């Protein structure tokens, strides 16, 4: 149908906007601490601690399959990256600190993204 196509163009445009959001968030991680999944070879107990691992490469895979229906779903995955790190790693660690700085800097980007998603519909 013509409606299914219109819907698909909206999703494609959301994907376009989320791709730009993702790039902006990932620039706030210049050490690349959050770029890839935590290695289960190097942290074999990880899944005993963290039940839903997340990282920017895994978000990008979902993004490119148009697997984010709305900004809420995308934000859920970004918050997993931060929250998983802040639980597994102690406060005095470069990892925890990186997550805090990503959360703080990402807030600004996500605030305007929400306005753009509502605005453009």
Curated annotation (Swiss-Prot):
Origin species: Homo sapiens (Human)
Protein name, entry field: Bromodomain-containing protein 1
Highest rank taxon of the organism: Eukaryota
Annotated signal sequence range: none
Compartments, as annotated in UniProt: Nucleus; Chromosome
Domain Bromo: 9-113
Full-protein residues shown: 555 to 674 of 1058
Record function comment: Scaffold subunit of various histone acetyltransferase (HAT) complexes, such as the MOZ/MORF and HBO1 complexes, that acts as a regulator of hematopoiesis. Plays a key role in HBO1 complex by directing KAT7/HBO1 specificity towards histone H3 'Lys-14' acetylation (H3K14ac), thereby promoting erythroid differentiation.
Tissue: Highly expressed in testis.
Quaternary assembly: Component of some HBO1 complex composed of KAT7/HBO1, MEAF6, ING4 and BRD1/BRPF2. Component of the MOZ/MORF complex composed at least of ING5, KAT6A, KAT6B, MEAF6 and one of BRPF1, BRD1/BRPF2 and BRPF3. Interacts (via PHD-type zinc finger domain) with unmodified histone H3. Interacts (via PWWP domain) with dimethylated and trimethylated 'Lys-79' on histone H3.
Positions of crosslink type Glycyl lysine isopeptide (Lys-Gly) (interchain with G-Cter in SUMO2): 41
